[PDB]
């Protein structure tokens, strides 16, 4: 298990800048970006075995993603990883890519969870750090609305519970994993 | 450092031939500012020699409360165990698990702190967690004549290997490298040595057989004391880029998490790249 | 450094330890600190080595200085050096004959704007207007001070219609102990103050200046340095970026300033 805690602290305080999360629903949070990221890399590195020198680039990532990310949510995550792709094909690479999930510790994370000899490209860890922060996104907007609702500032794993539960895709990802 | 890459050498090669020379002394100048550089690099080194002393009552106070062999005192129990927490946080933290006599010292220090370092957790397999789980203490000293530094991981008994101490030592130059003079930007390595690992029956989780039936190398923290030989008994250019990852690593744990143990322990020190 | 306990890496690992095993971690905290201030010592003494070092790199940087400025002639030593490294005796042969010699230049002409500029970050501060001020840069020079703490930079500038300063300095007051309000995020020297120096423009000359008068971009702004806390969190984040320009001319560049004039720094 990777921590990206602060990545999550940064996208929170984005889509919701008064607000604050709790330990428990940090924990949370962390499990369910790497329990993504990690179904992502296993589809990621048996495609590259069907690549004969274990090429590992967006493509493999955004077949992925379909693969994994319900209707709705991966024609999303797919836009938002092509928009970041392009942003950094043209400071550090996750701003150049525009984004504040880490590119270079996810293109090291791709290395290791998957291919070895061949070539993971920097546009793959790019597309891996926004479908992550998309996703991360979406919970913790749907939640801290939720924290607002009940007159609260903290998203806790309640408000967690209840994004999840009322919205089917989300829903859907969560259990599957 | 860098042939005809040179970011300018439209310039250097249009330039009049009596100012291509002017620039010819300077480069004969750098060489000088150079042998000057590798003299203050070789004071620092006695430098980090002569501090060894001044760190080394810390670092033995921090084995000890690791090794459960001496108790907080109070001064040391009102530091906080985290900075940068509401009041109500920290008592709460203090609070979120009562006291356990039957846990001696710190488990799985000097393991989480190696594992926490984003380089070192790259070296770092599933298999060698639980032999660094018996890692009772990291060292690190610099020695002159023959100038370098060892770094020793000490062992407790355990069923993985027979060694108390496994040893790396870097043998490194000072000196402007011939081969190269103006590429100097400090010590260099020369030499990397290990320690023969005496493993009990199957535990070797450096090496595995592939089918003729051959041994090869498997992927394992512990292929630092196995380091890559050097031209000196020597592809080429492998075995050389391997030998600057394993100095890189040599030089994170001897500058980097030796010095800063606990806050690796905690996880206060990351990178964002 | 994370100054959010929450966010601290193994922060789960830590909250379920026994009170009496976070006892014991809360003693390795305090402990750091010692270990912070002992380092805080090391840095101090290795600022007395690099002062003490001076003398011996101002030789070397002298004479560069006087090849530069077309003051002394290259003796047959340093003629024998090649221009370039990595050449051959065919490939450098070429290069020496492919311009004949010129009487007419004396020194190296634009040598300080060259290596400055093939820095990425210090050409990042150099606008298109500031290129022919600093042609007219003779030499950049950097000392060192134990009390008070810190360095300097000297620009040395000829005789130019831009402003009249032979030399604009810029100075750094640096801290040398760890902050004990915040001990263990110590890693080094850190910037109390940068200091720096009024510059006698020329009528209709001050490139740092617009009218739209109001601030340009220049590199010039490197001497009208932001205030630090006493003098008024953005302005503590231009000040550090001040601060790493200053260490990148101090400690890189000027030691190595003719491998950022050919480009063989990358």
Request: charged share 30%; no cysteine.
């Given at each position: 298990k990777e921590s990206y805690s602060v990545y999550i602290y940064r996208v929170l305080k984005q889509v919701h800048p008064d607000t604050g999360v709790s330990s428990k629903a940090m924990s949370i949070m962390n499990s369910f970006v790497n329990?993504?990221?990690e179904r992502i890399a296993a589809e990621a590195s048996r495609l590259a075995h069907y690549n004969k020198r274990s090429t590992i680039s967006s493509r493999e990532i955004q077949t992925a993603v379909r693969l994994i990310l319900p209707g709705e949510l991966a024609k999303h995550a797919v836009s938002e990883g092509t928009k970041a792709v392009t942003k950094y094909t043209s400071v550090s690479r996750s701003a150049r890519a525009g984004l504040q999930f880490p590119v270079g510790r996810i293109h090291r994370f791709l290395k290791q969870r998957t291919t070895s000899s061949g070539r993971v490209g920097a546009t793959a860890?790019?597309?891996s750090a926004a479908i992550l922060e998309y996703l991360t996104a979406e919970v913790l907007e749907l939640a801290?609305?939720?924290?607002k609702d009940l007159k609260v500032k903290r998203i806790t794993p309640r408000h967690l519970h209840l994004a999840i539960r009322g919205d089917e895709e989300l829903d859907t990802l969560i259990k599957a994993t | 450092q860098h042939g005809l890459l040179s970011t300018n050498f439209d310039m250097i090669?249009?330039?009049?031939?009596?100012?291509?020379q002017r620039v010819c002394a300077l480069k004969n100048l750098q060489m000088k500012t150079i042998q000057i550089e590798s003299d203050f690099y070789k004071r620092v080194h006695?430098?980090?020699?002569?501090?060894?002393?001044?760190?080394?009552?810390?670092?033995?106070?921090?084995?000890?409360?690791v090794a459960g062999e001496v108790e907080p005192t109070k001064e040391q129990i009102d530091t906080p165990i985290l900075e940068g927490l509401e009041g109500d946080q920290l008592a709460?933290?203090?609070?979120?698990?009562?006291?356990d006599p039957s846990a001696k010292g710190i488990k799985d220090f000097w393991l989480t702190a190696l594992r926490t370092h984003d380089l070192v957790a790259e070296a770092i397999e599933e298999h060698d967690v639980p032999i660094l789980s018996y890692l009772t203490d990291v060292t690190t000293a610099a020695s002159k004549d023959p100038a370098g530094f060892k770094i020793e991981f000490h062992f407790a008994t355990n069923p993985y290997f027979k060694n108390q101490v496994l040893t790396k030592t870097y043998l490194l130059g000072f000196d402007p490298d011939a081969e190269a003079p103006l590429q100097f930007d400090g010590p260099h390595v020369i030499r990397a040595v290990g320690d023969t690992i005496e493993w009990e029956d199957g535990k070797n989780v450096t090496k595995k057989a592939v089918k003729l039936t051959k041994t090869v190398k498997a992927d394992s923290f512990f292929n630092f004391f196995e380091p890559p030989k050097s031209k000196d008994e020597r592809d080429d250019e492998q075995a050389e880029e391997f030998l600057e990852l394993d100095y890189e690593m040599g030089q994170a744990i001897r500058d980097t998490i030796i010095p800063r143990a606990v806050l690796f322990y905690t996880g206060e020190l990351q990178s964002d790249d």
């Open positions: 329990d993504v990221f860890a790019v597309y801290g609305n939720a924290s | 090669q249009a330039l009049p031939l009596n100012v291509k006695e430098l980090e020699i002569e501090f060894e002393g001044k760190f080394k009552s810390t670092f033995d106070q921090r084995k000890a409360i709460e933290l203090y609070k979120a698990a009562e006291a």
